[PDB]
Ligand binder design. Structure first.
Ligand SMILES: CCCCCCCCCCCCCCCCCC(=O)OC[C@H](COP(=O)([O-])OC[C@H](O)COP(=O)([O-])OC[C@H](COC(=O)CCCCCCCCCCCCCCCCC)OC(=O)CCCCCCCCCCCCCCCCC)OC(=O)CCCCCCCCCCCCCCCCC
Ligand SMILES: CCCCCCCCCCCCCCCCCC(=O)OC[C@H](COP(=O)([O-])OC[C@H](O)COP(=O)([O-])OC[C@H](COC(=O)CCCCCCCCCCCCCCCCC)OC(=O)CCCCCCCCCCCCCCCCC)OC(=O)CCCCCCCCCCCCCCCCC
Ligand SMILES: CCCCCCCCCCCCCCCCCC(=O)OC[C@H](COP(=O)([O-])OCC[N+](C)(C)C)OC(=O)CCCCCCCCCCCCCCCCC
Ligand SMILES: CCCCCCCCCCCCCCCCCC(=O)OC[C@H](COP(=O)(O)OCCN)OC(=O)CCCCCCCCCCCCCCCCC
Lengths: 459, 171
């Protein structure tokens, strides 16, 4: 995996030696070349994983998250260059360096063969995200949101360090390839119960779980646009990736420890969607929608059936693209009205028709419109949870009702109605912004054509 | 532990040298010259056995030789010896330097009648050699069996198998 790590690090001399007007063009160009090269991770087999070295490997789960991670960096560079136009050049290069460094940490977080190196990279991804939020965030509450984002993740993950080093002492190795074959069944005890909690609660925070999600409508809102994109698209998916790696070691104790978290997530996908029905902040509406979608990924991981993992990884990739595009659309309003209040700017389809078409497509993919991979993930998780318990179809269908309701309420409020009279700075849509929306949506619509590359290790 | 094994009171009875310290100091150099051999057998037995219970016969030979020494003084040269140890006995620190004429009288009469020569400066402090017939003590400290040491290292130092083996560091 060194063939992606080395160009990602060579982005740093590429961004610290570029001209004062060239530091966006060159970084976008070469990160798009890295994203083109990221397709070579699709050499996957139906029995064996693509195993590179002692340090790095990539199965069919890590591969779509890797292509998504190496694709999201040019989109963050396009999104975050307008509000940093007035910025100092050195701080501009520092922002690009934090983005490049976060990509570097993520692409060797997903490919980490051994679990403590996964942990080191997984907690290494805090500090560029923390610096981006707390330094280039816009408002006063970026500092408190940085505190919440830091100290929920560390409070979840420092028990995970102790649990992983205990696995290193008991099994002899934290290699995932070794732990596929030396995995001992974990019986019922209190010690194995808190073993399970220390293994799971870090990723429960990072998904987020309902009740542990209070960091998210502050971190995803008070961030700048590139920070909100990477938080919505990759850093919620580190939790699902870590759960799918760590729940091998947690059988059969998962089959009764999963119940309180399954209740929390099945009820929180209703509660956060109802919250989205009464949000005045658009960026907070997209944040609580992200919690509402990742609750299904938590349930799909904890019921641990093959259909559930296929739906969970499709839902992760699809929600990454969709929620990143929704945050970029909210930025496209915020760069014109300078407020995140959803009831401020209305009637924008009269003024920005192509942008309203992008809003329409993103709101359709948010409410899981078939045959998108949003609906493929949503539907497969619904099938597997109906296999889990037949009564869960009530919660799943009521979540789908409220999800369609808040998605089209967002669409009708921002884009439809009569335009607000006292706002006269609604510029036309830039080529940069429409290109950003298209580079989100067009891969998402192309993945409906060949959806088998985003369906996990057990397609 | 074990019962300590003491000699009887009859094993300790010997005819004592019941003279004063100035009497012993007056004829000290002739005592070192003439009573050399049983005294050195005793002090070698005393520094080798490291036990006074293993030295009782040698101490009795010391006491017998000292008694014969003072009886051989008393028969021939009793009055210059009494004149000499009285003058030694007068002083508090009992100096030899204060009594050189009584010393000359005593040494003269002793050399003339008993043939004893007073040793020179340096002679009584010599480390001598002692011909004993008793065997050498094989374990005077009664030291038990020593603990066997830990095994030493041996063999050529091969490299570490797959490096440090520290979680993922392949070197
Ligand atoms: C690998 C090769 C693949 C080749 C085939 C391509 C496959 C599909 C690719 C994506 C297709 C959509 C692209 C256009 C929409 C986005 C841009 C836009 O809005 O432009 C408006 C504009 C036309 O409007 P305008 O008059 O100029 O101005 C806009 C108006 O002011 C105001 O605009 P508006 O709102 O009035 O009009 C927008 C209208 C609004 O209409 C809607 O929103 C209604 C759509 C939903 C209901 C109807 C469809 C339901 C599902 C049935 C169809 C799918 C299954 C069919 C199969 C059989 C049955 C199973 O939407 C459309 O007209 C889009 C038609 C296609 C819709 C596809 C589904 C989108 C819905 C959301 C996701 C649904 C699930 C995923 C489906 C994925 C299918 C592949 O279009 C363009 O200028 C198009 C430019 C070129 C687009 C290229 C797209 C492909 C790019 C990929 C590049 C790499 C691969 C190479 C292939 C290249 C092919 C050329
Ligand atoms: C006949 C005489 C002539 C013979 C000539 C032969 C050589 C020809 C080429 C000449 C150049 C040689 C260069 C070194 C050999 C290759 C080393 C290598 O790639 O190891 C793969 C190594 C393990 O992967 P592998 O596939 O198992 O091993 C492949 C080989 O067998 C690797 O071999 P190995 O198995 O023997 O490796 C042993 C072990 C293998 O590794 C392990 O066992 C895993 C543990 C490694 C450390 C993990 C620490 C994690 C926590 C801290 C993270 C820090 C932040 C990350 C970076 C942030 C940005 C600076 O290495 C270490 O543990 C060393 C520590 C890491 C340093 C790697 C060497 C760097 C040299 C250049 C420094 C330039 C700055 C680089 C960035 C600084 C951070 C690396 O990859 C990593 O650890 C990933 C991190 C990046 C490595 C650096 C890549 C080297 C080239 C960088 C060029 C671009 C620089 C851009 C500017 C500066 C940054 C902005
Ligand atoms: C995000 C905030 C909330 C975080 C919650 C994190 C999970 C909650 C539970 C964590 C427990 C602590 C780590 C356990 C690691 C288990 C590893 C192991 O070997 O276990 C078996 C071992 C068993 O011991 P052993 O393995 O040495 O024994 C040999 C094996 N037997 C048992 C067969 C003889 O368990 C323990 O030793 C104790 C486990 C419980 C520890 C209790 C103290 C911590 C209490 C919870 C703190 C929660 C966070 C507080 C901060 C919140 C925010 C401010
Ligand atoms: C707040 C925000 C939202 C929440 C975020 C996540 C935090 C909560 C995570 C923990 C969830 C609850 C604990 C796990 C419950 C799973 C099943 C279970 O253990 O039930 C309780 C147990 C039932 O009995 P049983 O399981 O038979 O016990 C023998 C097992 N050795 O009961 C008993 O045996 C008796 C009770 C013992 C004490 C339990 C309390 C300490 C441990 C949990 C804390």
């Amino acid at each position: 995996m060194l063939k992606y790590i080395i160009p990602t690090m060579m982005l740093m001399p590429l961004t610290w030696l570029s001209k004062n007007s060239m530091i966006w063009i060159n970084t976008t160009l070469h990160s798009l070349l890295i994203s083109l090269t990221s397709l070579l991770l699709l050499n996957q087999f139906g029995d064996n994983s693509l195993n590179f070295s002692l340090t790095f490997f990539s199965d069919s789960l890590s591969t779509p998250l890797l292509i998504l991670t190496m694709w999201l960096l040019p989109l963050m560079l396009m999104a975050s260059q307008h509000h940093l136009s007035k910025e100092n050049l050195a701080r501009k290069k520092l922002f690009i360096s934090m983005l490049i460094l976060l990509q570097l940490f993520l692409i060797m977080t997903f490919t980490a063969t051994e679990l403590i190196f996964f942990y080191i990279m997984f907690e290494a991804t805090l500090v560029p995200t923390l610096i981006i939020i707390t330094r280039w965030g816009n408002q006063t509450e970026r500092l408190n949101a940085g505190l919440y984002f830091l100290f929920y993740t560390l409070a979840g993950s420092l028990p995970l360090l102790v649990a992983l080093i205990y696995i290193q002492n008991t099994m002899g190795s934290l290699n995932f390839l070794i732990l596929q074959y030396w995995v001992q069944p974990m019986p019922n005890s209190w010690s194995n119960t808190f073993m399970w909690l220390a293994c799971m609660m870090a990723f429960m925070v990072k998904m987020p779980l309902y009740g542990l999600h209070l960091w998210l409508p502050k971190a995803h809102v008070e961030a700048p646009i590139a920070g909100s994109m990477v938080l919505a698209a990759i850093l919620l998916k580190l939790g699902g990736y870590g759960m799918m790696r760590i729940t091998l070691l947690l059988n059969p104790i998962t089959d009764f420890m999963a119940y309180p978290f399954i209740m929390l997530s099945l009820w929180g996908m209703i509660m956060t969607s109802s919250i989205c029905l009464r949000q005045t902040d658009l960026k907070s509406l997209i944040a609580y929608s992200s919690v509402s979608h990742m609750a299904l990924v938590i349930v799909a991981i904890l019921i641990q059936t093959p259909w559930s993992y296929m739906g969970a990884t499709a839902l992760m990739i699809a929600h990454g693209l969709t929620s990143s595009m929704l945050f970029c659309l909210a930025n496209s309003n915020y760069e014109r009205v300078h407020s995140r209040t959803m009831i401020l700017a209305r009637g924008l389809q009269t003024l920005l028709p192509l942008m309203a078409a992008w809003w329409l497509l993103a709101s359709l993919t948010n409410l899981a419109l078939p045959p998108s991979i949003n609906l493929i993930g949503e539907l497969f998780v619904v099938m597997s949870t109906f296999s889990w318990s037949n009564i869960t179809i009530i919660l799943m269908g009521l979540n789908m009702v409220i999800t369609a309701l808040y998605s089209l309420y967002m669409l009708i409020t921002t884009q439809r109605g009569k335009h607000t009279h006292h706002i006269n700075n609604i510029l036309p849509s830039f080529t940069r912004e429409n290109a950003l929306m298209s580079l989100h949506m067009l891969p998402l619509l192309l993945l409906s054509l060949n959806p088998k590359i985003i369906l996990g290790p057990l397609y | 532990p074990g019962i300590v094994e003491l000699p009887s009171l009859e094993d300790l009875k010997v005819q004592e040298v019941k003279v004063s310290s100035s009497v012993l100091k007056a004829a000290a150099h002739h005592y070192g010259a003439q009573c050399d051999k049983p005294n050195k057998e005793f002090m070698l037995c005393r520094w080798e056995e490291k036990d006074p219970r293993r030295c009782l016969e040698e101490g009795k030979l010391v006491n017998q030789c000292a008694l014969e020494f003072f009886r051989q003084i008393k028969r021939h040269c009793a009055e210059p010896f009494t004149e000499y140890w009285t003058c030694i006995d007068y002083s508090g620190l009992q100096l030899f330097r204060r009594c050189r004429k009584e010393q000359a009288q005593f040494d003269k009469c002793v050399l003339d009648k008993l043939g004893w020569v007073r040793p020179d400066l340096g002679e009584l402090s010599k480390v001598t050699k002692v011909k004993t017939d008793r065997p050498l003590p094989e374990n005077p400290y009664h030291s038990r069996a020593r603990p066997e040491p830990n095994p030493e290292v041996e063999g050529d130092l091969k490299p570490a198998r797959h490096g440090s083996r520290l979680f993922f560091w392949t070197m």
